Amino acid sequence: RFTSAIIVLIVINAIVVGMETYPGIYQPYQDWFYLIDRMILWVFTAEIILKLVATRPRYHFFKDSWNVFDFLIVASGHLFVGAQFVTVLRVLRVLRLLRAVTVIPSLRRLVSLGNIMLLMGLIFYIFGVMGTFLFRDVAPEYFGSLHLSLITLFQVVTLESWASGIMRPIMAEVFWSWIYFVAFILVGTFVIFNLFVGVIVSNVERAETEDAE
Amino acid sequence: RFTSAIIVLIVINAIVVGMETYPGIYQPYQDWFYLIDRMILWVFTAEIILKLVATRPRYHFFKDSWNVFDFLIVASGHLFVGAQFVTVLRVLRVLRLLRAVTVIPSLRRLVSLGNIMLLMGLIFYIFGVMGTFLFRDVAPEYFGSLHLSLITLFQVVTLESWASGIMRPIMAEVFWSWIYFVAFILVGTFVIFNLFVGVIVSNVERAETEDAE
Amino acid sequence: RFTSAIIVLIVINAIVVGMETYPGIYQPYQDWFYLIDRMILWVFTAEIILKLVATRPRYHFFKDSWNVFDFLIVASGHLFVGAQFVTVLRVLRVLRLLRAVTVIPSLRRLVSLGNIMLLMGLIFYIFGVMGTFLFRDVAPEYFGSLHLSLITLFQVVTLESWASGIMRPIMAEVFWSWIYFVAFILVGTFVIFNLFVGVIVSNVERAETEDAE
Amino acid sequence: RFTSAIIVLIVINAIVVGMETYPGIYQPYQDWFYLIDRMILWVFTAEIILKLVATRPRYHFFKDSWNVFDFLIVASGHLFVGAQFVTVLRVLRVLRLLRAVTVIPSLRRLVSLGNIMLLMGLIFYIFGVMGTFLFRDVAPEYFGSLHLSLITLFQVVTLESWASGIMRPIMAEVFWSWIYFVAFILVGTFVIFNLFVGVIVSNVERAETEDAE
Known part of the structure; x- marks a missing residue:
């Protein structure tokens, strides 16, 4: 249920990011999606932390590429909205949608010249x-x-x-x-x-x- | 001869639908193709009914996808010209040309990502x-x-x-x-x-x- | 040497037909290519005739598709310049360039849906x-x-x-x-x-x- | 180290030829790249000569296509800047970048219809x-x-x-x-x-x- 819960949020936040694009939706429910973003980032940090201990010694987590990706992704999203480059880090947050690739199998399967x-x-x-x-x-x-x-x-x-x-x-x-x-x-x-x-x-x-x- | 008879009509009505497109042909032989349409729909209803009994118990017919398709197709064509959406049902009638796929083998043959x-x-x-x-x-x-x-x-x-x-x-x-x-x-x-x-x-x-x- | 002789002419007449396209070349050497055309058609009729007897009884020649093609091709070229459709038959003469396919192997090799x-x-x-x-x-x-x-x-x-x-x-x-x-x-x-x-x-x-x- | 040294220069001169294209770079460091060109051509002539003796009797070198290519390439680059066609020979010098294909394996690997x-x-x-x-x-x-x-x-x-x-x-x-x-x-x-x-x-x-x- 843990994974399913995570895959769900990804899709949910994924659809929300698309709504966040519309200037119209932004006026009415700007805050609603704003808060949902903070909540998801939190649950993801907790998730990452749990995985860290469970991976085996914390080390192993840092061994896995998929895990490190999820780590780096969440990290960027963690950086305060404001910053030297408020915008870039703000936009890079969308990279979390890539979590979908890591969390769900098959996709990774697909991903000498x-x-x-x-x-x-x-x-x-x-x-x-x-x-x-x-x-x-x-x-x-x-x-x-x-x-x-x-x-x-x-x-x-x-x-x-x-x-x-x-x-x-x-x-x-x-x-x-x-x-x-x-x-x-x-x-x-x-x-x-x-x-x-x-x-x-x-x-x-x-x-x-x-x-x- | 039964199937051949049906495949024939399909092609015949198929060519007629193309003629029904021409506003010119419509003025002179508007009725001629109109009547031929009523006749074909009738022969098809009879066909469908016969198949229903022959399939084995009527049930089996409803089991086959190709048969159900032919059923639904004819059904729409059965709906009176007039209706809430006279036009849509009227245009969907052309879907009967798809009967060609069901009636004749091979086509069905052709029809992990x-x-x-x-x-x-x-x-x-x-x-x-x-x-x-x-x-x-x-x-x-x-x-x-x-x-x-x-x-x-x-x-x-x-x-x-x-x-x-x-x-x-x-x-x-x-x-x-x-x-x-x-x-x-x-x-x-x-x-x-x-x-x-x-x-x-x-x-x-x-x-x-x-x-x- | 017989075949080689024929393949040669084909290429030669083939290049000439391309020259016959140029209105300029036409003014100076219009006749020169004109006569060469009559000569080639003749040698080809002789060729066809010889093949006819050699094929086995004349019949066999008429059995082969490649031979019949060469026959029909030459026949059209035989039709007098003037005629009901002087132009069409005149232009179809270019079809003799297709003789290249018949005369030379491989090409024929290349030549469920x-x-x-x-x-x-x-x-x-x-x-x-x-x-x-x-x-x-x-x-x-x-x-x-x-x-x-x-x-x-x-x-x-x-x-x-x-x-x-x-x-x-x-x-x-x-x-x-x-x-x-x-x-x-x-x-x-x-x-x-x-x-x-x-x-x-x-x-x-x-x-x-x-x-x- | 011999080959590596040669492959290096090729890449180096290769990048220089691209700089030689810019009219701007030409004004400031026109001579710098000019001299480097003379130097590389020299080292290449020496290289070619060495290979010639080493190949086995000088003959064998002339047997190899890759070697002859490198020979001809360098030869053109040897022709004085000035000449009947100063420009063409001058531009053909770029062909030496093709040396990259000869010197490094694989490329040659890649290089009935x-x-x-x-x-x-x-x-x-x-x-x-x-x-x-x-x-x-x-x-x-x-x-x-x-x-x-x-x-x-x-x-x-x-x-x-x-x-x-x-x-x-x-x-x-x-x-x-x-x-x-x-x-x-x-x-x-x-x-x-x-x-x-x-x-x-x-x-x-x-x-x-x-x-x-």
């Missing part, structure tokens, strides 16, 4: 700098800076409005721009496909390892 | 509220409300016009907006891929279970 | 008619007609500009329009994924059947 | 020419030329703004244009899916061959 990731990162950097020198002057919004180039090239990998929005217009100035992007799309696309082809093989392999165990 | 679905739902809620507070004032159409945020964030997951349509314009006001969406896209995208990676493993597993049976 | 396809078709028809009645008046371009609805709903399945281009604007008039499309997208998307999940299982199964053979 | 690729290429050519004759006059930007048609048809395969951006507008002039594109999309899409269905089967097969070895 580095190599390819690094290669791709290198690729983006290369084309990012090249693109900047190639279209920054004429297209300052997209290619103006290295960071602007990074974001635009990420947009093209997602293939969102790459032609109509980016390439077609750029071709007006530079007819050969297609030479730059088509190849980029091919390489980027190709890697992504292989990446997936690799994640699933490791997936199926895990299934077999599971049967062995 | 909850966990991930819940996690994602939680995620959208979190970002939905955050986005509302972050861009609602400046971007009332997209972020104005919690529900508006939900729809816009769903659009970005589909990756449709996220950059050109949403992000680029939002960056004008908030340059850091990219920090909010890129991460969102990664998380959302990542889950989706894993979700698929899981549905297919359960799929292939079913294939093996089938051979065992 | 019906059930789902039918279900989906039914689905589109249902929503197509519903959409027409729902937004045709206000949105005649997209929903104006049943066929217009079909094309727009196909666009949304491809997920191309569904929100920014279609849904967002439609919401201006109808705020609940999202209720109609989101569900549509889910159903359509879901089926597509399962469809793929099925094509690949049949694919892998074929691989195993191949090893058995 | 021809048949389908050829078929698709043929397909694009066919539709490319047809599209040109069909919409070039009215739509010169998209269909104006054979090459313009190629790029636009590639855009539609990516499914980016095909309807809203291309098809819808084209329908204004030609209502039947949908007949041309829908089929194109189906064929192109279908092949792509099968292509993937084939790459992964070869992938999984390699996994099995690996266990055999």
